[PDB]
From a paper:
The endonuclease PvuRts1I from Proteus vulgaris (strain) has been reported to be a dimer like most endonucleases that catalyze double strand breaks. Here, we report the crystal structure of PvuRts1I at 2.35 Å resolution. The structure reveals an N-terminal PD-(D/E)XK domain in agreement with an earlier prediction and a previously unrecognized C-terminal SRA domain.
Crystals belonged to space group P4(1)2(1)2, contained one molecule of PvuRts1I in the asymmetric unit and diffracted up to 2.35 Å resolution. We therefore conclude that the N-terminal part of the enzyme (residues 1–140) harbors the nuclease activity and henceforth refer to it as the catalytic domain. Therefore, the C-terminal domain of PvuRts1I (residues 141–293) will be referred to as its SRA domain in the following. The pocket is formed mainly by Pro207, Trp205, Trp215, Asn217 and Glu228. In agreement with the biochemical data for the PvuRts1I variant used in this work, we do not find the predicted dimer in the crystal. Thus, it appears that the tag, despite not being located in the dimerization interface, together with crystallization forces could be responsible for the unusual monomeric state of the protein in the crystal.
Author numbering: -6 to 290
The structure:
C-alpha cells in the first residue's frame, strides 16, 4: 500500500523542512519555533518559497514560511536582499515560483532584536495562524493537509476550478489532464493535449483549447522563455520544418518546473493566447488571458 509515484514521505518532508540550512541569523530559529509551538499537523507549511506579489511586476520575493490553506506567508526581513539573490536566481531557473495572489503578508524584522522580542513576535504570528484556521473551519472552508494528494487532480476536481497559486501544481501530465476530461489509464508524454469540444465549452472557454506543457528555456529545437512578470511566453523554433501557424484559441499552460531535489513538476501559469501582431512564423508570443480556469466536472 505504498505510493508508487512518491519520492518523499510526509514525515521526511517535515524533518528536512525544519532542519534546512540557512544564512539568515534568525530564520532556522523562527521557523522551528513557529512550527513546533503551532503543533498542528493538519496545517500545511512550505519553507523558503520564492513568490510573486500582485502588482510588483517582474519582482521576486522570498517567503520564509508560506501557508497554502490560509492565504498567508511570513517574511523574516533581512536588511540585505542582495545575498538572497542566489537562491532567487536558482528558483527562477527551476521555475520554483508561487504567484501569491491573494495572500496576506506578515513580517518579522530579522535585525536589531532580542531573543525575547523574537519569541514575542512569533507567538503573535502563531496565534494569527491559528485564528485564520478557525475563521475558516468556522465557515466550513478548511481542508486538512492531504500530503499524499498534493500533486494530483483531486483537490481541483473537488473545488471546480483552479488558479495560479501554491496548489495548482501537478506531478505528471496526466494529473493535469484529468482536470480536463482525460479519462485514459495511461500516461501522456507529448507537449500538448487537445480538449474535446464538450469540455472546452463546459469549463467556459470558446473555440479550440489545448493544454500545453512547455519547457520555458532553450531545449531541443525550441528556444522558449517566460517574461519577468510571468505574463508573456515567447517561442522560438530552431528548426524550419517545425515552423507552424497557431491554430489554438487558448492554451492552458502547465509549465515544466523543478523542485529543490530537481524532480519535475508542472506548474499552472494560467490561460494564454497568441498575440498575432507580435508574432511570426518563427517566433510566437503568447500573452496571458486568465490566471484561473474551471475544472471539468
Amino acid at each position: 500500500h505504498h505510493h508508487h509515484h512518491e519520492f518523499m514521505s510526509k514525515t521526511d518532508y517535515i524533518l528536512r523542512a525544519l532542519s534546512k540550512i540557512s544564512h539568515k541569523r534568525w530564520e532556522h530559529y523562527i521557523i522551528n519555533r513557529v512550527v513546533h509551538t503551532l503543533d498542528d499537523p493538519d496545517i500545511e507549511f512550505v519553507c523558503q518559497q520564492c513568490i510573486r506579489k500582485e502588482g510588483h511586476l517582474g519582482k521576486i520575493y522570498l517567503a520564509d514560511l508560506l501557508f497554502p490553506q490560509l492565504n498567508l506567508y511570513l517574511e523574516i526581513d533581512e536588511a540585505h536582499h542582495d545575498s538572497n539573490d542566489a537562491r532567487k536566481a536558482d528558483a527562477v531557473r527551476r521555475l520554483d515560483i508561487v504567484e501569491a495572489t491573494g495572500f496576506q503578508e506578515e513580517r518579522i524584522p530579522a535585525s536589531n532584536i532580542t531573543l525575547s522580542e523574537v519569541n514575542k513576535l512569533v507567538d503573535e504570528f502563531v496565534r494569527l495562524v491559528k485564528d485564520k484556521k478557525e475563521e475558516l473551519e468556522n465557515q466550513g472552508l478548511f481542508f486538512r493537509w492531504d500530503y499524499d494528494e498534493r500533486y494530483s487532480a483531486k483537490k481541483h476536481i473537488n473545488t471546480g476550478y483552479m488558479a495560479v497559486g501554491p496548489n495548482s501544481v501537478f506531478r505528471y501530465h496526466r494529473d493535469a489532464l484529468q482536470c480536463f476530461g482525460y479519462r485514459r489509464e495511461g500516461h501522456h508524454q507529448s507537449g500538448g493535449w487537445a480538449l474535446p469540444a464538450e469540455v472546452a465549452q463546459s469549463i467556459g472557454l470558446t473555440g479550440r483549447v489545448m493544454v500545453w506543457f512547455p519547457r520555458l528555456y532553450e531545449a531541443g529545437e525550441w528556444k522558449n522563455a517566460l517574461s519577468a512578470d510571468g505574463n508573456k511566453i515567447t517561442e522560438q523554433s530552431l528548426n524550419a520544418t517545425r515552423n507552424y501557424q497557431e491554430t489554438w484559441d487558448y492554451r492552458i499552460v502547465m509549465a515544466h518546473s523543478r523542485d529543490e531535489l530537481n524532480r519535475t513538476l508542472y506548474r499552472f501559469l494560467g490561460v494564454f493566447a497568441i498575440d498575432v501582431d507580435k508574432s511570426s512564423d518563427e517566433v510566437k508570443v503568447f500573452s496571458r488571458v486568465y490566471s484561473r480556469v474551471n475544472v471539468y466536472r
